[PDB]
From a paper:
Radial spokes (RS) transmit mechanochemical signals between the central pair (CP) and axonemal dynein arms to coordinate ciliary motility. The RS is a macromolecular machinery consisting of more than twenty subunits. In this work, we reconstitute a mouse RS head-neck complex and determine its near atomic resolution cryo-EM structures in both monomer and dimer forms. Our cryo-EM analysis on the reconstituted mouse RS head-neck complex revealed the presence of both monomer and dimer forms.
In contrast, the RS head-neck dimer consists of two copies of the RS head-neck connected by the arch bridge of Rsph16-Rsph16’. We then determined the cryo-EM maps of the RS head-neck monomer and dimer at the consensus resolution of 3.28 Å and 3.57 Å, respectively. In addition, in the arch bridge, the Rsph16-Rsph16’ interaction appears to occur in two areas, involving electrostatic interactions between their C-terminal α-helix and hydrophobic interactions between a part of the DNAJ-C domain. The M309I mutation is located at the Rsph16 dimerization interface formed by the C-terminal α-helix. The mutation of Met into Ile may disturb the formation of the arch bridge and impair the stability or even formation of the head-neck dimer. Our local resolution analysis of the RS head-neck dimer revealed relatively lower local resolution at the very end of the Rsph1 arm and the peripheral portion of the neck. To further examine the intrinsic flexibility of the complex, we performed 3D flexible refinement (3DFlex)49 on the head-neck dimer in cryoSPARC and found considerable relative movements between the two monomers. Specifically, Mode 1 obtained through this analysis mainly describes an open-and-close movement between the Rsph1 arms of the two monomers with an angular range of Rsph1-rotation up to 12.5°. Mode 2 corresponds more to the seesaw-like alternating up-and-down motions between the two monomers, with an angular range of Rsph1 arm rotation up to 8.2°. We then fitted our high-resolution cryo-EM map of the reconstituted RS head-neck dimer into the cryo-ET map of RS2 in the head-neck region, and found that they overall match each other very well especially in the head region, and the lower portion of the neck may potentially contain additional component.
Numbering used by the authors:
A (entry chain L): 285 to 292
B (entry chain C): 1 to 46
C (entry chain R): 257 to 261, 271 to 291
D (entry chain P): 1 to 113, 133 to 193, 212 to 276
E (entry chain O): 615 to 665
F (entry chain K), G (entry chain B): 136 to 316
The structure:
């Protein structure tokens, strides 16, 4: 879910 | 996290995509991204 | 490899002579 | 052939001897310019003639950007009155196989073998383009954008490369194009030198009346089919 | 044909392609410019041997 | 909630052929936090009309229409509609031209002069006997497809034959010797 | 009550022209006085077809249908319809005759042979140039009125023009000198 911190 | 899946799937493509979009600064970046991804296949897969 | 990765039209004065000169052949 | 073949008699300069009168040549210059106007073609080359028993079909071919596109054919009996000929398909290729004989000037003529003479015109012009439409080696450069353009830096063939059939290409779908050295029969192409050997003339034997022009010193080239419009099936006997 | 009162009578044989005949109405001349062959609607049959 | 307004906006053939753009000024019934005002925040909505959009193609602007105190605005500017032309009738990616051919030209060789939406002029041969059900297809020269603007459909050329209104008895003999034999 | 037995009364234009009699077998479906039993004689309903009856006029039989357990039926054998005669179709009070005509006779006049429903042969002269959108009214020659069996409607003679399938160059010059002038 929390791609906002993960990958961007 | 889901990073590894999308580590493998996209990689260089999104990088070149937003690099070109930031350089060009079009009026509609999202449509530009979609068209660029289409063109990116049309060069790579073919 | 680098080359890999509502339109108006204008035309020359050479067809108004051609417009004019078809009457020669009619 | 292009408009440069209609400012001077390039057709009769090949020594085939069949071509256009200066009447038809000037009329064709004005009419093909008007065809390039009315039909937005990149170029409008004079395809040639289908010599009929009543009147001759003067044929023109539209060229797109994008020159290997399915080129758009036009016909005219009185030269100037150009009309958009329909495109060709495989059914219309198979349709005219039962018919033989010389073309009639009226394209409304009917054969009982019905079959319209317009369909014959369409199919025979398509067959001639797929078989014996010539492009010299390097005149067309496959652009990286999936489109064929004129190789506008093309220098004419060296005289060593003049004599080889490998230096000439079929102007159709397929250096991208197919060469003439596989165009069976092996002797099906006649190469000869005219006009001080500043002129290469390459005539089809399978489709008589075709004569391909080329000046090795420059990029002046072109092909014209001025002839009867039948296929020489007797070619292997005649060779 | 655009100026018919100065036309020249053209003749196309249809038996020997490239064969031509011409005349202004007073004089005439002939000319062959073909491959030297006779036209035939049927394909060329090699002749059968003797019986 | 209140429905979106299914506004109809008329586009001629060249607008849907070349892919024009259109502006439609919208209502001024936008509410503030007070929930009794009537103001406007975005005067104009713009639609990038692409080539080949068929009739009935719905373009919807969520959260842009009229709004009450406790409902979500929405609007369907616009349903694609076609203006009358001189003349091609819009069907599924095909153009239907009507040529008022005269009789005598219908029965013999004829050439039909078709101005297109490209501002290109066509001389289409008609070598068939034009009876009043005949049509010639000029393929690959209709309007662009909505799924592919490079490719275009087929142009249909129908014929409205103009029969003669009066014939001399000589013309009656002319016709009787010609047609009934 | 139980719904009507909706049935189509099949009648050709000759029969509605003259009138006839038709019998419909209900037959063995009414509930008898045994309280209850479906076994019934082969009961029959006759319809006296009067001349000039229109398509869709309702013939209704009260209490003649499949009677239920104390339920009032009705054998509604009612639609007057519609058999396409070999020579005529029917609009309101009007027979529409289609005459296949060759183009030479269409343009240079003819006489149309109409065989009526009354078994009369009508030689109707056609001396106007027959347009594709052309008809002649032969008044008083249609079907009889339903409101008046002495009065009659109008016969419409439409034309299906048969163009030629082949024309020689002589025939093309023939037509060109004839029509296009």
């Amino acid at each position: 879910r929390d791609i906002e911190v993960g990958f961007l | 996290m889901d990073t590894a899946y999308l580590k493998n799937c996209f990689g260089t493509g999104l990088t070149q995509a937003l690099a070109e979009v930031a350089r060009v600064r079009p009026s509609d970046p999202i449509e530009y991204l979609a068209h660029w991804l289409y063109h990116y296949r049309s060069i790579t897969v073919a | 490899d680098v080359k890999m990765a509502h339109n108006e039209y204008e035309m020359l004065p050479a067809y108004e002579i051609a417009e004019t000169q078809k009457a020669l052949f009619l | 052939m292009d408009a440069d073949s209609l400012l001077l008699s390039l057709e009769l300069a090949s020594g085939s001897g069949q071509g256009l009168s200066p009447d038809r040549r000037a009329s064709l210059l004005t009419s093909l310019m008007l065809v390039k106007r009315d039909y937005r073609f990149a170029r409008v080359l004079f395809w040639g003639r289908i010599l009929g028993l009543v009147a001759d079909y003067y044929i023109a071919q539209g060229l797109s950007e994008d020159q290997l596109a399915p080129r758009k054919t036009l016909y005219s009996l009185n030269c100037t009155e150009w009309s958009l000929l329909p495109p060709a398909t495989e059914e219309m290729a198979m349709q005219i196989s039962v018919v033989s004989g010389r073309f009639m000037g009226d394209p409304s003529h009917e054969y009982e073998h019905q079959i319209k003479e317009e369909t014959r015109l369409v199919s025979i012009i398509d067959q001639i383009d797929k078989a014996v439409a010539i492009i010299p080696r390097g005149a067309l450069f496959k652009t990286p954008f999936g489109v064929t353009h004129v190789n506008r830096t093309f220098e004419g063939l060296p005289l060593s490369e003049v004599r080889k059939l490998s230096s000439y290409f079929h102007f159709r779908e397929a250096d991208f194009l197919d060469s003439l050295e596989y165009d069976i029969p092996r002797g099906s192409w006649s190469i000869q030198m005219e006009r001080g050997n500043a002129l290469v003339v390459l005539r089809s034997l399978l489709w008589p009346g075709l004569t391909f022009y080329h000046a090795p010193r420059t990029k002046n080239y072109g092909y014209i089919y001025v002839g009867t419009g039948e296929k020489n099936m007797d070619l292997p006997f005649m060779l | 044909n655009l100026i018919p009162q100065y036309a020249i009578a053209v003749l196309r044989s249809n038996l020997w392609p490239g064969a031509y005949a011409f005349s202004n109405g007073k004089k005439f001349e002939n000319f062959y410019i073909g491959w030297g062959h006779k036209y035939c609607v049927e394909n060329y049959t090699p002749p059968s041997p003797p019986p | 909630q209140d429905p979106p307004i299914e506004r109809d906006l008329y586009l001629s053939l060249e607008d849907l052929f070349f892919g024009c753009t259109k502006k439609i000024k919208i209502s001024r019934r936008v509410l503030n936090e007070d929930r009794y005002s009537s103001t406007i925040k975005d005067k104009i909505l713009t639609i990038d009309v692409r080539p080949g959009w068929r009739q009935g193609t719905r373009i919807t602007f969520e959260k842009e229409g009229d709004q009450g105190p406790n409902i979500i605005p929405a609007d369907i500017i616009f349903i694609v509609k076609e203006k009358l032309h001189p003349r091609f009738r819009r069907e599924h990616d095909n153009l239907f031209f009507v040529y008022p051919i005269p009789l005598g030209k219908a029965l013999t060789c004829c050439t039909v002069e078709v101005k297109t939406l490209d501002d290109r002029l066509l001389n289409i041969p008609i070598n068939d006997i034009v009876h009043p059900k005949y049509f010639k297809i000029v393929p690959g020269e209709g309007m662009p497809l909505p799924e592919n603007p490079s490719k275009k459909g087929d142009l249909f050329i129908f014929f409205d034959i103009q029969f003669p209104t009066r014939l001399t008895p000589q013309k009656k003999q002319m016709l009787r010797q010609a047609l009934l034999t």
